[PDB]
Amino acid sequence: KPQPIAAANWKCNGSQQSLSELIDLFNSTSINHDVQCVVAPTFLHIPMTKARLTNPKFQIAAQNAITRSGAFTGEVSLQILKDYGISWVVLGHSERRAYYGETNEIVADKVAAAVASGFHVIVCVGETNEEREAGRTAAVVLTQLAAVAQKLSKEAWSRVVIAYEPVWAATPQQAQEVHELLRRWVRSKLGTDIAAQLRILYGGSVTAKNARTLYQMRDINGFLVGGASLKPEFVEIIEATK
Amino acid sequence: SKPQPIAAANWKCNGSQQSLSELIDLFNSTSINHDVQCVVAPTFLHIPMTKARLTNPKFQIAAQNAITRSGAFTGEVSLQILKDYGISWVVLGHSERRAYYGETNEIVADKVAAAVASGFHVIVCVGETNEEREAGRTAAVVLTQLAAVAQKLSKEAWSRVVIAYEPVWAATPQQAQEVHELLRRWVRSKLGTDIAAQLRILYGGSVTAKNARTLYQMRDINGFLVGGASLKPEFVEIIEATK
């Protein structure tokens, strides 16, 4: 397996006090194995997190971006993130696909720009319950992945990370099967080396209680964690990637 | 007669730490000796540095957008997160968000109601496109935008409401005044003499040091929501035009 990633998606949550307490815990947590930890605060909380986080095994990510600075009231661009020394970004999260009109095309454009600008990107994919029940999981997630892949160069794949979100929800067996589906497509289109090096993270419900059983699956390379990542239990989730 | 004017700077999706720190230094050194509320709206990422450095007593800091509630909304910032950070102004319904980011009248209205409820001053943006104006639908469009917001508010909320008119279709000062007057008269009919007289309606078209005074001169214009010029020293002259 490639180097695992334990990523904390704080989503639209946090106060200065609560996040300070949580970051202090992360700072006192000794990460001793080969794992890349990532924390993704809201834009407003990035400066405070950057100033307070000292743990050398952690990188800070944005939860979204648009490609270029300009007349886009309310948005934050990759240019602005880079100026602030942020080099990781989560794109295509199921909530943005749902609420904020992010189509396969929009996601692909964002991903292409980010990796070309040297960002590591966590690209989110996943199918609905209606799509899963119809037997269309592979058709849907590979269409999502194909849209993103069409832009990317060989070298760009070193900075791509995929996160599978079972929007339909999951067992580790079910998760592992979709991760196999994704990796198979990549192997077929981009070759054995890129497929072997690619991190595919599980982005469903992850807790201290289920993280080890998930990480043990052959094609799961870590997690994009929701609610648990605002809690001290995130420590146990990082430990599950040994 | 006119209520306190507002000069608001919408920085949009722009700025580096360096460029904004120079801008903030300039604003800090600018002496302003008349009653005016200045507002600067940085990107979310730049709000912390602006809060820590901005000192000019005439200025407040605003967000360029927000969502109603905290939770599972990856990529967004909520009103409560802004309030915890000590931000008390917000721009909502900007034309770029209505056009690019799916903000309907109802979505804007829900956000505005939530912001007022949580103690924010809100600059609520309305405005019609070229297609709409050419069709003779200016009034219908802006009053529909306005009425949708008003429906979710009651008279008490209005002390914290500011309207900004964006002539997206582009304007002469007379063209601006025509819309501002139509807006204020609608408010007067629905909320009464006092609310309508005290309401700030800002012009949010192209404002420059050159044209600002002529605009401020119109009866129903109470200041500006400024785009590109707000990233420049020219903004200083625009503030002066509200004197």
Author numbering:
A (entry chain A): 4 to 172, 179 to 251
B (entry chain B): 3 to 172, 179 to 251
Question: How does the study describe this entry?
Answer:
Take for example the glycolytic enzyme triosephosphate isomerase (TIM) from two evolutionarily related pathogenic parasites, Trypanosoma brucei and T. cruzi. Both enzymes are homodimers whose three dimensional structures superpose with an RMS of 0.96 Å and both have an identical catalytic site in each monomer formed by residues K13, H95 and E167 (based on the numbering for the sequence of TIM from T. brucei (TbTIM)). Of particular relevance to this work is their remarkably different susceptibility to sulfhydryl reagents like methylmethane thiosulfonate (MMTS): the enzyme from T. cruzi is 70 times more sensitive than the enzyme from T. brucei.
This chimera and WT TbTIM exhibited almost identical inactivation profiles at low and high concentrations of MMTS. Taken together, the data with chimeras TcTIM 1 and TcTIM 2,3, 5–8 it may be concluded that, at most, the 13 different amino acids in region 1 of the two WT enzymes account for their different susceptibilities to MMTS at concentrations higher than 50 µM. A displacement in region 6 is also observed, which corresponds to the amino acids of the flexible loop involved in enzyme catalysis. When the pKa of the thiol group for Cys 14/15 of the wild type enzymes and the chimerical enzyme TcTIM 2,3, 5–8 were determined anew, under the same conditions, the values turned out to be 9.27, 10.53 and 10.61 for TcTIM, TbTIM and TcTIM 2,3, 5–8, respectively. Altogether, the data show that the relevant residues of regions 1 and 4 modulate the reactivity of the interface Cys through long-range interactions and that the interface residues do not play a role in the susceptibility to MMTS.
